[PDB]
Structure 1
Amino acid sequence: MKRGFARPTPEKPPVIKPENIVLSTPLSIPPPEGKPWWLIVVGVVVVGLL
């Protein structure tokens, strides 16, 4: 002998929420600017030699 059991309408499951995400584009390296260091080196010598 067994106990009776009636299945009701299933209870509401927790809702899943999908998502669409686009990644940020990386940074770009600063290109190689160059100073004429030697020019000022001659400069300080000339004003000094004076």
Structure 2
Amino acid sequence: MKRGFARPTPEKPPVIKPENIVLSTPLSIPPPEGKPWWLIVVGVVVVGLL
């Protein structure tokens, strides 16, 4: 002998929420801008020699 059991309407399960995400594009390395170092080196010599 067993106890009776009637199955009711199922309870609401917790809802799953999807997500579409697009990534951030990485930074770009700065190209090599360059100073004319030798010019100012000769400069301080000429003004000094005067």
Give the TM-score, by structure 1 length.
0.98
* In structure 2, C-alpha distance between the alignment counterparts of 1:49 and 1:43, rounded to whole Å: 10
* 1:33 Cα deviation after fit: 0.5
Matching of residues 1-50 of structure 1 within 5 Å: 1-50=1-50
Aligned-residue offset at 1:21: 0.3
4+ aligned runs moved over 3 Å, structure 1: none
Aligned length, in residue pairs: 50
- Structure 2, unmatched stretches of 5+, are none
Structure 1, unpaired ranges of 5+: none
